[PDB]
């Protein structure tokens, strides 16, 4: 049930990110950036399938897993940062990025500004284009859907969302984080028992849940205001052939959102999952390798 063995790297900011680096003997380079509640360990069974063909870097992003955070993120560009000095610091030039959630906002940004690096970029049950909002919630727990969260402080006071969350991490509940899965992801299929202890224990790890989410509400890469902050435009940017991946019963990130992703992105392609929630790897995996293998071949 441990983690996988990990290497480390110090960049010029004064962190130091932990990577897992597998297929080291191919010529094909796959960097993977996962997403909210987890590290590189959530892509354990992407590596497994994919490692004996590509050269894979899988990042704990800062405050993730076994990464630093010695300062805080306010921002998925933060992130996108992290990536860009890892890569100088690793010498890569040119590679395949796919990013999960979360992961796919840092990865649309990474690949808005640095253009001359991603070959292919694809997006797994990424974050839309203006980010994902948090309300207020009433007295059931549920949101007010015309009263929008703004700032750091007021995420820091959801008592719903974000609390237990930290409570979780302070107090090791590994059964809270099995709880909130298993209703909104795993509602179908679960990974395998020693597997999901894995998972549970990488949850545990997280450092940065409140940043994290001040840097979801207020991620706009699109030409318009999202109710928060104005739109960077900067999605236009992203020219690498992008592909979109989206599950037909995502119940943290809807089917419009992938569908608005497709939209907008210059260079992009569409596939919907059947009978897939936020993780094609526990729903679907062979589908979604088949997927991934053919985007990466073209």
Known sequence: IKPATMEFVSLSNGETIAYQEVGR?????????????????????????????????????????????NQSIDSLQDFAEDVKLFIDELKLEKFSLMGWAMGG???????????????????????????????????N?????????????????????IAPVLDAIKNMNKLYYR?????????????????????????????????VNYALITFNISDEHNGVVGGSKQIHRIKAPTLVIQGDRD???????????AKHLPNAELKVLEDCGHSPFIDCLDVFIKHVEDWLEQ
Request: aromatic share 10%.
């Open 25 to 69: 003997r191919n010529t094909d380079i796959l960097v993977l950036i996962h997403g909210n509640m987890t590290s590189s360990q959530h892509w354990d069974l992407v590596i497994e399938k994919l490692q004996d063909q590509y050269h894979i870097y899988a990042l704990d992003l800062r405050g993730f897993g076994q990464s630093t955070y």
């Open 105 to 139: 906002g840092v990865a649309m940004q990474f690949t808005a500004n640095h253009p001359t690096f991603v070959e292919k970029l694809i997006l797994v049950e990424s974050v839309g284009m203006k980010g994902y909002p948090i309300f207020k919630k009433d007295t």
């Open 141 to 161: 727990g549920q949101p007010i859907v015309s009263s929008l969260v703004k700032t750091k402080e007021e995420i820091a006071q959801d008592p719903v969302q």
């Open 179 to 211: 709880t909130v899965w298993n209703l909104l992801i795993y509602t179908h299929n679960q990974p395998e028992p020693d597997r999901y202890e894995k998972y549970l224990d990488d949850m545990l790890t997280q450092r940065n849940f409140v940043d």
């Open 251 to 261: 119940y943290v990130v809807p089917q419009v959102v992938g569908e608005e992703l």
